Design a protein around this ligand. Sequence first.
Ligand SMILES: CCCCCCCC/C=C\CCCCCCCC(=O)O
Length: 142
Amino acid sequence: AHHHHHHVGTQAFDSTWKVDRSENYDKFMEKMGVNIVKRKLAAHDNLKLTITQEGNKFTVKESSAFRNIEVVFELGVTFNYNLADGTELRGTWSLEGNKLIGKFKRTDNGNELNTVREIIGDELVQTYVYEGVEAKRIFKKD
Ligand SMILES: CCCCCCCC/C=C\CCCCCCCC(=O)O
């Protein structure tokens, strides 16, 4: 007696999507209290994203008009992330039920930010909620 068989797959998110559009971002940056100049480049930064994962550890490369760095996280591993000005927040991402959670909190007053990751049709999306305001950026393959 004997038998055999085989198949194959291929992830979807593991791609290179660049900022093709955004929604409500204006209120998000305005909320924090960003200056006209800071809102000029942070709006037309041309964020280029590259998604690559190997297990429960994801690594994405992001580049902007004034800088660019690579970040690495782990599902369910809280770590300290620093900002361009030096602020350090304690946050990360973790899946729940059938959705992905992303939360980070300021050290000043503990402002809780909430972000979820999803994909619609042929465009990647990431939502961010700040004080009731829910803004998101739509990245299309580059
Ligand atoms: C020059 C103006 C100040 C720059 C504004 C910073 C805007 C965001 C840029 C870098 C910080 C990004 C922090 C994201 C945390 C991880 C979330 C994720 O896994 O997608």
